[PDB]
Amino acid sequence: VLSEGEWQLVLHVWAKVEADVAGHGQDILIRLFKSHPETLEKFDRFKHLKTEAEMKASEDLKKHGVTVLTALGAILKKKGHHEAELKPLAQSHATKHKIPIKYLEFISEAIIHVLHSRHPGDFGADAQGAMNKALELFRKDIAAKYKELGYQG
């Protein structure tokens, strides 16, 4: 579990993300798609996009980034009590979207890179450590639901 002090490091930096959800969501998805091109192939909506410049120009991608970060924020703010929020997400990601757990690890790494670029002063090693723990918790709970339903392990 995270301590109360580690949750406070997480949510302090997240309040800052909430100043510009759309810009954050962009940088994260672009970083994901460039670092791990195979992830872009999951998105019928985005697979036509070939360059970073086309990505940065897509309003629909920016819209999806807000969808993603809003759902994540609602989970973080539950500070681990996130069962009701996380269940619907794991079901759709397992059964509809077919998203490997490994891809959730990839987007976690994208999230941490972008927070580090945008908020150095609020995102030192101790906050980075806390955020890494929160994302691990998120992945571990999703992984449990996947296993239940019989999805890739």
The secondary structure of the chain in percent helix, strand, coil, rounded to multiples of 5, reads 80, 0, 20
Beta carbon nearer to ligand HEM, 66 or 121: 66
- Determine, following the binding rule CB under 6 A, whether residue 140 of this chain makes contact with ligand HEM: no
* Whether the Cβ atoms of residue 135 and residue 112 lie closer than 8 Å to each other: yes
Question: What are the angstrom distances between the C-alpha of 65 and each of 54, 68, 80, 130, 153?
Answer: 15, 5, 22, 22, 27
- Determine, following the binding rule CB under 6 A, whether residue 55 of this chain makes contact with ligand HEM: no
Tell me whether residue 64 is annotated as binding.
Answer: yes
Closest CA to 114 of 35, 43, 58: 35
- Determine, following the binding rule CB under 6 A, whether residue 68 of this chain makes contact with ligand HEM: yes
Residue 124 zone, left/alpha/beta (φ > 0; ψ -120 to 50; rest): beta
- Determine, following the binding rule CB under 6 A, whether residue 99 of this chain makes contact with ligand HEM: yes
Report the nearest approach of ligand HEM to the CB of residue 116 (Å).
Answer: 17
Beta carbon nearer to ligand HEM, 5 or 96: 96
Q: Which residues are annotated as a binding site for O2?
A: 64
Residues lying near ligand HEM in the complex (CB under 6 A) are found at: 39, 42-43, 45, 67-68, 71-72, 89, 92-93, 97, 99, 103-104, 107
